[PDB]
């Protein structure tokens, strides 16, 4: 369990172009479970939403065909930084709704825009446990 305050910015400036490229080349709208009751905070909750999205990106790499693996992994590499922190397993209170990969990608980009200016300024060690608030 680390301080979770990142030495240098893990959020790149070209994430929007990478996300739009995957959104435009996706042959099928894969079924993905975004969270519906995460504790109300844009900054604190941003990391939690990215942790859930990163699991989906890794899962998509194992089911997409040969031609889509490179494009899916490109998105995975932009959000892989969440695996460096000791985030704890999701609680049983967590609820989520089924959506499409296009919506998950758009939501992921939105969370990165919100987290980017704060990721190296605040200590997020207290965010390792995902919290719910119905």
């Amino acid at each position: 369990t680390q301080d979770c305050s990142f030495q240098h910015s893990p959020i790149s400036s070209d994430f929007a172009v990478k996300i739009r490229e995957l959104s435009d080349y996706l042959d099928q709208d894969y079924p993905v479970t975004v969270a519906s009751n995460l504790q109300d905070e844009e900054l604190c909750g941003g990391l939690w939403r990215l942790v859930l999205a990163q699991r989906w990106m890794e899962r998509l790499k194992t089911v997409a065909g040969s031609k889509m693996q490179g494009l899916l992994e490109r998105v995975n590499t932009e959000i892989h930084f969440v695996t460096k922190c000791a985030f704890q397993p999701p609680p049983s209170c967590l609820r989520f709704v089924q959506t499409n990969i296009s919506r998950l990608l758009q939501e992921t980009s939105e969370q990165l825009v919100a987290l980017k200016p704060w990721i190296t300024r605040q200590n997020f060690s207290r965010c390792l446990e995902l919290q719910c608030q119905p």
Binding site: F6, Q7, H8, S9, P10, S12, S13, D14, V17, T77, E78, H80, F81
Partner: protein
């Protein structure tokens, strides 16, 4: 007396008038002085692209005797051309290029993706977001020609130049310096310092792009819009996990052209390649052209300076001129090279009046001195070099006798290379 200059024209006005000896001149431009060094005599009066400013009263006199000359350079078409100025996007992480010229010119971007600096695709869009590493270049194409600009980027992920890197800037023109850093992990940061002191608040600009297998590439730009004698100092750029690379930055309120200056006299032998080069370091873009009895040949620009050579000699001796008129300062440099072909005496002049002048030619080592040897000779040539243009070929006459020998005819050249004689 009256000169008419149409647009940024490139013509020569350095005519030569027969004045050999102890003669030295000094150029007197429009309410300003101009240092020159002529060859007696002809001084630097030729112009390449006569700017709207470069026109008016131009005087020239000899100081030893003192006679002054006067020329009136006059000039409507609204033709303008200026080097492009770089800029940072308004509320966006991108760099847009703009050029102050009439009319609006087409600006394209270049980035040599290969290991070294014609190749790589040009994206003519002005607003450039994709800019990481490689040689960044921005050129404009207006109705008055083509004015190029180069965005300086010092790549930290490379071996050091070790030749004291420098970049002179024009007072008012913005200053830009970027660092193409490559680190395997995301934990790497670049910082800007002048002399161990942090960069100004209006200079920080981060653009970290992620590339290749789990690897990041960050770039820390240094933006200074209005430059002045306040920011004339050596700027360094150190990184968290990369060595400290640095580059000095000097300012000039007008401009600068500096050149080492050679001996301007060569005893070049037959063939042997031979080249006439100039060591010139100058700001801004040095417009160069070599002149040789009507010839017009433009020139190209370890790393302390940018030199250029003129290897189009092809055994053509004489005075070679090298002008370099920048967008503010002027410079000229003449050099003298002679052929080592020492020489066959054959150009005799059949003069009937008292004695026939028998002359031997070529260059530089030539001596005319005429079965058995005959005593008492006439003239012995002896004259100074570079004495106005007129007739083709120069010879050293040395024959004017009054003895009655009949059919014999003088002229027998003797030199280090050998001997020859006329009829």
């Amino acid at each position: 007396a009256a000169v008419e200059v149409d647009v940024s024209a490139s013509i020569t006005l350095q005519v030569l008038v027969d004045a050999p000896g102890n003669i030295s001149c000094l150029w007197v431009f429009k309410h300003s002085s101009l240092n020159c060094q002529p060859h007696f005599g002809v001084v630097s009066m030729v112009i390449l692209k006569m700017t709207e400013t470069q026109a008016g009263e131009y005087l020239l006199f000899i100081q030893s005797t003192n006679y002054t000359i006067l020329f009136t350079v006059s000039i409507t078409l609204l033709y303008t051309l200026r080097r492009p100025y770089f800029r940072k996007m308004e509320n966006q992480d991108a760099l847009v290029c703009i050029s102050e010229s009439v009319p609006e010119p087409i600006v394209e971007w270049v980035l040599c993706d290969s290991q070294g600096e014609p190749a790589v695709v040009k994206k003519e869009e002005k607003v450039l977001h994709e800019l990481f590493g490689m040689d960044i270049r921005c050129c404009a194409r207006n109705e008055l020609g083509r004015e190029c600009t180069r965005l300086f980027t010092i790549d930290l992920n490379q071996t050091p130049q070790t030749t004291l890197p420098q970049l002179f800037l024009k007072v008012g023109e913005p200053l830009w310096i970027r660092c193409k850093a490559v680190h395997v992990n995301h934990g790497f940061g670049l910082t800007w310092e002048l002399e161990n002191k942090a960069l100004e608040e209006g200079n920080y600009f981060e653009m970290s792009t992620y590339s290749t297998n789990r690897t990041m590439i960050r770039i820390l730009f240094a933006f200074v819009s209005s430059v002045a004698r306040n920011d004339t100092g050596y700027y360094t750029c150190s990184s968290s996990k990369h060595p400290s690379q640095s580059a000095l930055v000097t300012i000039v309120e007008k401009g600068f052209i500096n050149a080492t200056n050679s001996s301007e006299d060569y005893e070049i032998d037959q063939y042997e390649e031979f080249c006439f080069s100039v060591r010139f370091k100058a700001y801004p873009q040095i417009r160069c052209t070599w002149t040789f009895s009507r010839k017009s040949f433009p020139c190209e620009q370890d790393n302390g300076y940018s030199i250029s050579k003129f290897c189009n000699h092809k055994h053509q001796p004489g005075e070679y001129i090298f002008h370099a008129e920048n967008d503010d300062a002027q410079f000229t440099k003449m050099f003298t090279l002679n052929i080592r072909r020492k020489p066959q005496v054959l150009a005799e002049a059949s003069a009937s009046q008292a004695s026939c002048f028998s002359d031997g030619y070529p260059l530089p080592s030539w001596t005319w001195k005429k079965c058995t040897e005959e005593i008492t000779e006439g003239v012995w040539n002896r004259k100074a070099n570079r004495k106005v243009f007129g007739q083709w070929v120069s010879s050293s006459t040395l024959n004017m006798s009054e003895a009655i020998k009949g059919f014999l005819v003088k002229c027998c050249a003797y030199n280090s290379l050998g001997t020859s004689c006329e009829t």
